[PDB]
Amino acid sequence: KKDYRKKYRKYVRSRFQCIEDRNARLGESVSLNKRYTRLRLIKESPIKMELLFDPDDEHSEPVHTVVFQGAAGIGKTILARKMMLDWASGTLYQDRFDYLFYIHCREVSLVTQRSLGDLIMSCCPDPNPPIHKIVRKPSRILFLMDGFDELQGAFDEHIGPLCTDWQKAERGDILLSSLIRKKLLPEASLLITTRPVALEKLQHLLDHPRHVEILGFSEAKRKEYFFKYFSDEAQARAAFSLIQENEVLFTMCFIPLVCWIVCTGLKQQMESGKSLAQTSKTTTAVYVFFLSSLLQPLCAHLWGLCSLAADGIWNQKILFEESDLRNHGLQKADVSAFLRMNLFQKEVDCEKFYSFIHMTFQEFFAAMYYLLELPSRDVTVLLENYGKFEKGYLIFVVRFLFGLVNQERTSYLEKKLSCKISQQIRLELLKWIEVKAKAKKLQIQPSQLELFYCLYEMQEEDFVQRAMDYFPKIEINLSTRMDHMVSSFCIENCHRVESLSLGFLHNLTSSFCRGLFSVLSTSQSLTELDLSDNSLGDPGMRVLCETLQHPGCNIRRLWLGRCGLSHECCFDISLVLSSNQKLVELDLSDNALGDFGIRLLCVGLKHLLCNLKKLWLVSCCLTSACCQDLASVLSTSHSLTRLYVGENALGDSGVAILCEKAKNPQCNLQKLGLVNSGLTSVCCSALSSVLSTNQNLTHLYLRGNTLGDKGIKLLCEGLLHPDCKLQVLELDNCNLTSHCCWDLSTLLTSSQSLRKLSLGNNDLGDLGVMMFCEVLKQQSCLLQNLGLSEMYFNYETKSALETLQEEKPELTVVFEPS
Amino acid sequence: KKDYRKKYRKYVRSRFQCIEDRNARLGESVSLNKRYTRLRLIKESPIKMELLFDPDDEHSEPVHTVVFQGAAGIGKTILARKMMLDWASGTLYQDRFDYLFYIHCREVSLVTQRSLGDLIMSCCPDPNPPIHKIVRKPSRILFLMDGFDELQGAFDEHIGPLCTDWQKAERGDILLSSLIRKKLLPEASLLITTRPVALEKLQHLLDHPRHVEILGFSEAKRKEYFFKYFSDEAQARAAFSLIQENEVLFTMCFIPLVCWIVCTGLKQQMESGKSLAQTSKTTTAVYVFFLSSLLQPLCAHLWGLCSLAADGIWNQKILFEESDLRNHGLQKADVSAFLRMNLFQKEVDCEKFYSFIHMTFQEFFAAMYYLLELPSRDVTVLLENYGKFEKGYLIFVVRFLFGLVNQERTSYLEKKLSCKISQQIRLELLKWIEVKAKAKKLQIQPSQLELFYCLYEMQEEDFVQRAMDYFPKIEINLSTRMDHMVSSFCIENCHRVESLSLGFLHNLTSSFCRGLFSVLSTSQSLTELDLSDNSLGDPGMRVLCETLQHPGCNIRRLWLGRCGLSHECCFDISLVLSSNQKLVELDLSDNALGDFGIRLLCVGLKHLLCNLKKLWLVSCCLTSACCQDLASVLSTSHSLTRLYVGENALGDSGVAILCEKAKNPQCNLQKLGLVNSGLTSVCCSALSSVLSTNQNLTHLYLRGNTLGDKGIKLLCEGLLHPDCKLQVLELDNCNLTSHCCWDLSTLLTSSQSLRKLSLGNNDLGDLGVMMFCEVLKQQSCLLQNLGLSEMYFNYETKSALETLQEEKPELTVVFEPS
Numbered sequence A, B: 001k002k003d004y005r006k007k008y009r010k011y012v013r014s015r016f017q018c019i020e021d022r023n024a025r026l027g028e029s030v031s032l033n034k035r036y037t038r039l040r041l042i043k044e045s046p047i048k049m050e051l052l053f054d055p056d057d058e059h060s061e062p063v064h065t066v067v068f069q070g071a072a073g074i075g076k077t078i079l080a081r082k083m084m085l086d087w088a089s090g091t092l093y094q095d096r097f098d099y100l101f102y103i104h105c106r107e108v109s110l111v112t113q114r115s116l117g118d119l120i121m122s123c124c125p126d127p128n129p130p131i132h133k134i135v136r137k138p139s140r141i142l143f144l145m146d147g148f149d150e151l152q153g154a155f156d157e158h159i160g161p162l163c164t165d166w167q168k169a170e171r172g173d174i175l176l177s178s179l180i181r182k183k184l185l186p187e188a189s190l191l192i193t194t195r196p197v198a199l200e201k202l203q204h205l206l207d208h209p210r211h212v213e214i215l216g217f218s219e220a221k222r223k224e225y226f227f228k229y230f231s232d233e234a235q236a237r238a239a240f241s242l243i244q245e246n247e248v249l250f251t252m253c254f255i256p257l258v259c260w261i262v263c264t265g266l267k268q269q270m271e272s273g274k275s276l277a278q279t280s281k282t283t284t285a286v287y288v289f290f291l292s293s294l295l296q297p298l299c300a301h302l303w304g305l306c307s308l309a310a311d312g313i314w315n316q317k318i319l320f321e322e323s324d325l326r327n328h329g330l331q332k333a334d335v336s337a338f339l340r341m342n343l344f345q346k347e348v349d350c351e352k353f354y355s356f357i358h359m360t361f362q363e364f365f366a367a368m369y370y371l372l373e374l375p376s377r378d379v380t381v382l383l384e385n386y387g388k389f390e391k392g393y394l395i396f397v398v399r400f401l402f403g404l405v406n407q408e409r410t411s412y413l414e415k416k417l418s419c420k421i422s423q424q425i426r427l428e429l430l431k432w433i434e435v436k437a438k439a440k441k442l443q444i445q446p447s448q449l450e451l452f453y454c455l456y457e458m459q460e461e462d463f464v465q466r467a468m469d470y471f472p473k474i475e476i477n478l479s480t481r482m483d484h485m486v487s488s489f490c491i492e493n494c495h496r497v498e499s500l501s502l503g504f505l506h507n508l509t510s511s512f513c514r515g516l517f518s519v520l521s522t523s524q525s526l527t528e529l530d531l532s533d534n535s536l537g538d539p540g541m542r543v544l545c546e547t548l549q550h551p552g553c554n555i556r557r558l559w560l561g562r563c564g565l566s567h568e569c570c571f572d573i574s575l576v577l578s579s580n581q582k583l584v585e586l587d588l589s590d591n592a593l594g595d596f597g598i599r600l601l602c603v604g605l606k607h608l609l610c611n612l613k614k615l616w617l618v619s620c621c622l623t624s625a626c627c628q629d630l631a632s633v634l635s636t637s638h639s640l641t642r643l644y645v646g647e648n649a650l651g652d653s654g655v656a657i658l659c660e661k662a663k664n665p666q667c668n669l670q671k672l673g674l675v676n677s678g679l680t681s682v683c684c685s686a687l688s689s690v691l692s693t694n695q696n697l698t699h700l701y702l703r704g705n706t707l708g709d710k711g712i713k714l715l716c717e718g719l720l721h722p723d724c725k726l727q728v729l730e731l732d733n734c735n736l737t738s739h740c741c742w743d744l745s746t747l748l749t750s751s752q753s754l755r756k757l758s759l760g761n762n763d764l765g766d767l768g769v770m771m772f773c774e775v776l777k778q779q780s781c782l783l784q785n786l787g788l789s790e791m792y793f794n795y796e797t798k799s800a801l802e803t804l805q806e807e808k809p810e811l812t813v814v815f816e817p818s
């Protein structure tokens, strides 16, 4: 007859019409989900809400879990609400799921015992839905869990009694684990929204999740928001222009919540006949401006509320009863005012409790508590409990505290912050940074990012510059405009930073990094810049190359990784080499800088006053052709001493060119990086001439080649020469056999210059090694690692090797295989 | 980063380079697996090592278990080692298995408790491989179990506590059972090598194995072995030729272990400047020649070693410690000499124990122990424990004892055998043969094969000829040249054998059997030769037919089975019939001897002095056309009395021809085998004429025809004739119905000649039987089986049948259906 499934879709469609889905909607108006602004979704390329659980391009395996992550206040909930509306309307997943259930984490009781009644409680008023029929069929139901990080009370991931069978009642935390792990109602599809910081407590439940990141609004959508928010286009234009002119506030407003806070304040200024001026620069300033603007016209009850918020955070309470309001002196006065204003809501979805409009607001209020004039009111305790899931990580409580603790304060609630208290806290906050800044560890506690966002908020020179003294090495990751804004601010004020590592995330290949590179080049302490494995295309390298020509750079070491740089960029690299007399080490490996790029690079390398000493051209798609220019550089330049060119196609016909010039008596080559070049015995006579002539050559790296016995014999003849000064010889994957052990024995016996000789996976067997063991006792000069890498020997050889280590202590490393 | 799988692949490639994979390699040289000689592999057509675990041509089912069987020293291990090398090199199963684990059974502790650490212990020195990750994934791993029959200690197949879950520890015997049965680490692939004798203790674990037999070297491969073994072509040629001239030693060298022991002894004769002469004829001769040659130059410690070997076999010990050597007086003298020579090895694969170079050698030493001058030194005990898995079956200990117990002994250790002891044993060995020879049973104890191999080794006329007196019937299976050599020798010396059955295995259709057939035809006791179901094509039949013409044959009965003989061979069969006046019974059924072949066969059958009495032409693709020649044979020959021609197409139009001549009053036909000929009622008037005319006809077999009531009625008219002498009438599948019961009742009532009348699956029902029950009481002459085959009746009929049996005792078999 009447199919509940249809009744449920009607319920969902009609229910989720409001954006907030809570009261105090500026006179209880309808905000309309029709105003939904599209979010930028990136998968780990863009992703849509459609096809989230579908198989991808290979193996054709299904997806059971998709997790949405991002910053707070970015519409994770709103995206879920749009999804529910589109599903109910029959436009989204209309051919995939029979039922869609939404479970908010805020309302979940973690410590109480219940059966899986979530499918009843989250749906229609009808107390008897067909749970035992179609609604229990696996794979036909889609669930969404909103706010994993908002789960209150104790929580654990490693629970024996997981609880399967939806019919049985168990603790709420346990029940959630079983559903997330797909042990309860298996094959069900589940969407989870969470802050990245809480992923560490979720990853154990997910096993193999699909990862989707939610990004903020683009400039195009920022304008759209104002025009949809303000019904009068003239107001939308004024509101948009005002904020657009404020680069910092505009950027922060990329976060939908910040945009909302700002738009609401401007609307109120309009209604009140005010100038609509707004000078906020920090996240704190946005929250302080909004709160004081709304209460100023109330303010008398700020204490009772801040105490409530602090008690709420400490005791893991988000949803409050009338008793909790009364216990803080909040009754029949400010509560009503708070509900009239966009500050608090009374939760009108057929329930009986009160709540803050946002968790960032509750944390903001708690932050204010610690500065006014009641769980503790001790910032030491606040900071110590930062690294905890149960307390909600307290990211904003502390970050707002940083911004709030200042001297440059005015009226509008900012005068209610006690001076002595703020001063005592300021000192504690700086010490906190020192302790965490020195902790180079990966965890939920600050990852050397949050410390900088906190310092950005506390935009004061004395405090900020002192904090920077605890960051001699900075390792950070930038994904948006606000991150670069914070990074540039913080690094600009660093006078004691020696090295910086910058990770770049989908924002790349553009001028977006100019605002940071421009700053780095003016640093008087930065020596090493690490840009490894960042997709910065030629345009990114060009911006860097422009900044690397600044006379005040002081940068001595520049490292690149799998950036995909093209041969074209060698034009700009050469321009840097020709004028930057400070650069010593330049690693251009793992790029597409083919023979042409090298031809151009060599222009800078041969340039007068070019002081580059170490050059890595490893894995640069090079052939033997480039050896003509590289050989010219080594001969021409007095500064090049280290050259690595392996993982290319510089075979015997190529190295012969390098050798012709490398052998020059005036050659300054110290390390010859002929690793994976595919060399054989043919060029070994050329190497012999180099080793016996160039007395500055101390290290050979010949791993990856196929020299054979003939090749090593020819090299030995060179190494046996009186004028050979080679100290380190690496012979691992050189395809040598036991037949050459006689030449290696001769080398060990007669060589005087070698200090390290490492033999790797060669077919020397027991004969070669046993022979060496005896030879090495005959007044040998070899004191370093013998090699023996990836080898298996018999008992007697193993005994001889261990014996050698004990009988001749001057040999530091025999390196037995095990 | 670094994948263990790759590190392991490297380990396996570097490890398995030697053939022996043990020391004492003639100066510790490298034998090189590169010298591997291809083995002949036959599946139960040739098979390759590739695709062993793949599905075949139907059902597309996977193979989890593959079992390799063959002679001791046939290269089961070396094949396994080559497999590992080819896999590690990425040429064999490179796209099927990620890991390959080799577990030797010799090193397995059956009685101790352990987890499945075999995946750690069998690999590289690294103590912490990723067992809990990729290495525990089912179906991605191939295991090889080498030497099931070498498992020491107690063992059982029917164990409740099989032990699943690789993480849990249990007894080694139990652990192996679970892995073999695929209960532990299920869906894994396992290759098992074992001696055929031990299959009986493995079959319970395998359930549904793929069977591959390993055969020895061909003549061409033997040449290659010598030319690869001896680096000097001149020496390889002289060495090969020496052996080629020795037919018996040459034949034995089909086993890699035999060609090895022969080549090794010769190499030493070469180095020592000797004549290189070798006169060995038996396996024992080769083993003692080798051992004595090596020790003669030592011999003083033969006692202590033989005692050790005997103690080892008795107490199930293969791997010995220094304590076991010392306890037998073996210390700092001969042990070193034994390790220098190819006799003993000290197991140098990072271990601490000693072992015999070959298991057949350890058993050889034990065999000598019993003859010298300490577990027992009682041959009675040795022989009694032959039929035991735990003791290793003791096949060679006893077989070598047979060869060693002789009078024709010389120096070179053969003089260390005590005369009195050998004489006492010789008597016990002969009695042992008597006891086992009379035991016509299938088991691990001698299957009437090993007894003959033992007698071959003991090549002495008195002992051997006496042994033959216990084999009046010989049933043997020959698969190789050495089997024919032994069979020929043994049967040649049989003076009291009445019948011989020969199974021929892939060796067929060739002259390979000539060496045996030539001997059988000279036997003065052999009467019956059974060659059933052997693929001996016309060439095989021709060789037989040549030997069947020998005047001393004395063969009276020759039986053929599904041999696939062609009509062409009837020419040679006829040649035998025309001159062999002794042959009485010739069964040519289940062949392709169609009408043409019969036309030719009939030439011999009609030949003067052809005494063949019983001829079977059943299932010979015959039609009614052949009846013209068969009828001529029956009329022409005075000797043919029994003719079976069913399972052909000799329908009514055919039998009418046979009847025209069979009815002749001078006809000597006694049994008319017209079974499955497709006859009906039409020819029954012709059969009637035969019955009433030929008084020598006593048996009719009409099963398979479709006569109906009319057909049997017509036969009854013949049977009711005063001159009909038929005694036995078989009427089973004749398609008769209840309507004929009155003619059968008339037949029973009036027939005087019948003694047996068997009615089978005819629709006679309860009425027919009830009628017969009463008729049979009226002074009936029917005393034999009434039939009632595949019939079902009601209560009253059953009662009448049982009553009949009791009331009229002269009726031997009522044959109630149940």
Ligand SMILES: Nc1ncnc2c1ncn2[C@@H]1O[C@H](COP(=O)(O)OP(=O)(O)OP(=O)(O)O)[C@@H](O)[C@H]1O
Binding pocket: A019, A020, A035, A036, A037, A038, A039, A072, A073, A074, A075, A076, A077, A078, A079, A146, A147, A150, A193, A256, A257, A260, A358, A359
């Ligand atoms: N795509 C969007 N279109 C319009 N408004 C949006 C959008 N995304 C976010 N917002 C704004 O976000 C505010 C609601 O904040 P919200 O409840 O989503 O914070 P939240 O982080 O999702 O809560 P939670 O942590 O439980 O998921 C509303 O003012 C709404 O207008």
Ligand SMILES: Nc1ncnc2c1ncn2[C@@H]1O[C@H](COP(=O)(O)OP(=O)(O)OP(=O)(O)O)[C@@H](O)[C@H]1O
Binding pocket: B019, B020, B035, B036, B037, B038, B039, B072, B073, B074, B075, B076, B077, B078, B079, B146, B147, B150, B193, B256, B257, B260, B358, B359
């Ligand atoms: N295909 C082959 N090519 C070369 N030599 C072979 C080959 N097969 C066997 N051999 C010889 O086998 C000898 C080693 O004896 P082996 O260990 O194989 O006896 P085994 O019966 O396999 O031991 P196990 O009973 O444990 O399997 C070596 O001398 C080797 O030359």
Ligand SMILES: CC(C)(O)c1coc(S(=O)(=O)NC(=O)Nc2c3c(cc4c2CCC4)C=CC3)c1
Binding pocket: A070, A071, A072, A073, A195, A196, A197, A252, A255, A257, A258, A283, A360, A395, A449, A450, A479, A482
């Ligand atoms: C990208 C990164 C640094 O790695 C990260 C991952 O997760 C986090 S977060 O949990 O601390 N979220 C936030 O800070 N949001 C947030 C921010 C600002 C202002 C507001 C909010 C919330 C509404 C007001 C200013 C930029 C960050 C940060």
Ligand SMILES: CC(C)(O)c1coc(S(=O)(=O)NC(=O)Nc2c3c(cc4c2CCC4)C=CC3)c1
Binding pocket: B070, B071, B072, B073, B195, B196, B197, B252, B255, B257, B258, B283, B360, B395, B449, B450, B482, B483
């Ligand atoms: C196939 C059959 C006949 O059914 C069978 C009966 O017994 C067995 S066996 O498993 O015990 N193997 C052996 O005897 N090998 C073996 C043989 C010879 C010489 C030697 C060996 C071992 C090295 C020296 C001569 C032929 C058999 C198999």
